Design a protein around this ligand. Structure first.
Ligand code: HEM
Ligand SMILES: CC(C)(C)OC(=O)NCCCCCC(=O)NCc1cccnc1
Length: 460
């Protein structure tokens, strides 16, 4: 297998027997992709164990894979370990099952449904502020992943199931307890590395019902969804606008498929939201001029701490620029992937069946050929004056095409609502214990080496 790219005349790091190139991951995914890009150029190949991976960087070629040939050739992501019933989660589903689920769930993420969710999301922005203000009167440094983690969970529990908890102050509520365990997978941790070198072991784990999603957590949520939905709604009169209800009414979805989506939405939104929010606040704290400009825009659109609404959020240009520039620096998916379903030739290049085609978002977001001073946090990149220069196949923090992030509008609205309420009430400033400049972890997740900690000061 390791002779493939040699045979195709494609450059890349020479693989070791059994391991392929996984020892090159010792500083994480992002640094590996940056280095390969720099030394091999537009395209290169490497091996995750025996699995060939073709990295591509040409915008026209990326469009062909993500958009033009999605349905016919590049429909699925890479399989990744024993997954059990979660095979029917939309992000993991393949081919026709994916196509169907994406159709059933599309109406659930429309702007119109999002708008109805905004009052519920906004309420936990108020909870965030009150919890935050408790520490803004203390003077003690604040760990952002913790306060934003609680915010993120609060929004998830309420918009997913109409479960309404102050998770920061209700830390061992059972619902909070379980959902908190739905963290992103570290694909460089010993378990997933072993599965990469011994992929032939996955069917053995499936037959023993061993699953990468914790059975205890998935059991709890299954029963909850069944008991919340069991007959609790035996009255009907109540309306309801959460994802469960939207999916309930869209019942078409299997009952098991329904619960698979309920879970993947928690998994998709929990740590990603709190992570991005932490990165944003770090950039704002270390760029006071940007934080001040943003607070000025917010006060202009929402005088005297007026509550944010759907339309006033969408009116905030600088807020959008700040969010987008943070996701440029910190595209937490790191890579986009599609499996090549059949031999093809795209944009002049032959790609064999079975190869994983990878779009290295992190490396493209910091590519000097597309970005001036790529390491610098510069929101004006995304101004009306400058944004037209931005290629949508180079800037891909939510992916692109039919399999892009279905939660994109929701996540952006969620984070913007949080940022607005927080910035209306507080300024965030570096600590002596603040890590400056921020360093990234060497593990398989795009996260700070040490947690972001900041001082929080009440605006009056
Ligand atoms: C800032 C937060 C988020 C970021 C940066 C993000 C980013 C991404 C990216 C890069 C992809 C892959 C797209 C591709 O392969 O082209 C993706 C897929 C996906 N995301 Fe998100 N995401 C976020 C939050 C969410 C939320 C809140 C939800 C659900 C409520 C969600 C649900 C999904 C799903 C279901 C997929 C797979 C879609 C499919 O396969 O059809 N994500 N996300
Ligand atoms: C953003 C984080 C959570 C790091 O994961 C990604 O890279 N997101 C893009 C993959 C799309 C599907 C994500 C997702 O939520 N589905 C399950 C999953 C989990 C881990 C790896 N692959 C699939």
């Amino acid at each position: 297998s390791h002779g493939l790219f040699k045979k195709l005349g494609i450059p890349g790091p020479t693989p070791l027997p059994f391991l392929g190139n996984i020892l090159s991951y010792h500083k994480g995914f992002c640094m590996f992709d940056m280095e390969c890009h720099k030394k091999y150029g537009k395209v290169w190949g490497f091996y995750d164990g025996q699995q060939p991976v073709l990295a591509i960087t040409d915008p026209d070629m990326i469009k062909t894979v993500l958009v033009k040939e999605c349905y016919s050739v590049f429909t699925n992501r890479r399989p990744f370990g024993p997954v059990g019933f979660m095979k029917s989660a939309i992000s993991i589903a393949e081919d026709e099952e994916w196509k169907r689920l994406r159709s059933l769930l599309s109406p659930t993420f429309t702007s119109g449904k999002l708008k109805e969710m905004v009052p519920i999301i906004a309420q936990y922005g108020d909870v965030l502020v009150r919890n935050l203000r408790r520490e803004a009167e203390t003077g003690k440094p604040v760990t952002l992943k913790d306060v934003f983690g609680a915010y993120s969970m609060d929004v998830i529990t309420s918009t997913s199931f109409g479960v309404n908890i102050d998770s920061l102050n209700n830390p061992q509520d059972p619902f909070v307890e379980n959902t908190k365990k739905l963290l992103r997978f570290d694909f460089l941790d010993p378990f997933f590395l072993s599965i990469t070198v011994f992929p032939f072991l996955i069917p053995i784990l499936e037959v023993l019902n061993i699953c990468v999603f914790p059975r205890e957590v998935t059991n709890f949520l299954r029963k909850s969804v069944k008991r919340m939905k069991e007959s609790r709604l035996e009255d009907t009169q109540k309306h309801r606008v959460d994802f469960l209800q939207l999916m309930i009414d869209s019942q078409a979805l299997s009952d098991l498929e329904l619960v698979a989506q309920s879970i993947i939405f928690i998994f998709a939104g929990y740590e990603t939201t709190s992570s991005v929010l932490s990165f944003i606040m770090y950039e704002l704290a270390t760029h006071p001029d940007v934080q001040q400009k943003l607070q000025e825009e917010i006060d202009a659109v929402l005088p005297n701490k007026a509550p944010p609404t759907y339309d006033t959020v969408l009116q905030m240009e600088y807020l959008d620029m700040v969010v987008n520039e943070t996701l440029r620096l910190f595209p937490i998916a790191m890579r986009l992937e599609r499996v090549c379903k059949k031999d093809v030739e795209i944009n002049g290049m032959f790609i064999p069946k079975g190869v994983v085609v990878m779009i290295p978002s992190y490396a493209l977001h910091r590519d000097p050929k597309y970005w001036t001073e790529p390491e610098k946090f510069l929101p004006e990149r995304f101004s009306k004056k400058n944004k037209d220069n931005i290629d949508p196949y180079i800037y891909t923090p939510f992916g692109s095409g039919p399999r892009n992030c279905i939660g994109m509008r929701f996540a952006l609205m969620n984070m913007k609502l949080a940022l607005i309420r927080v910035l209306q009430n507080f300024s965030f400033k570096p600590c002596k214990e603040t890590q400056i400049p921020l360093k990234l972890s060497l593990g398989g997740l795009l996260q700070p080496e040490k947690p972001v900690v900041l001082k929080v000061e009440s605006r009056d």
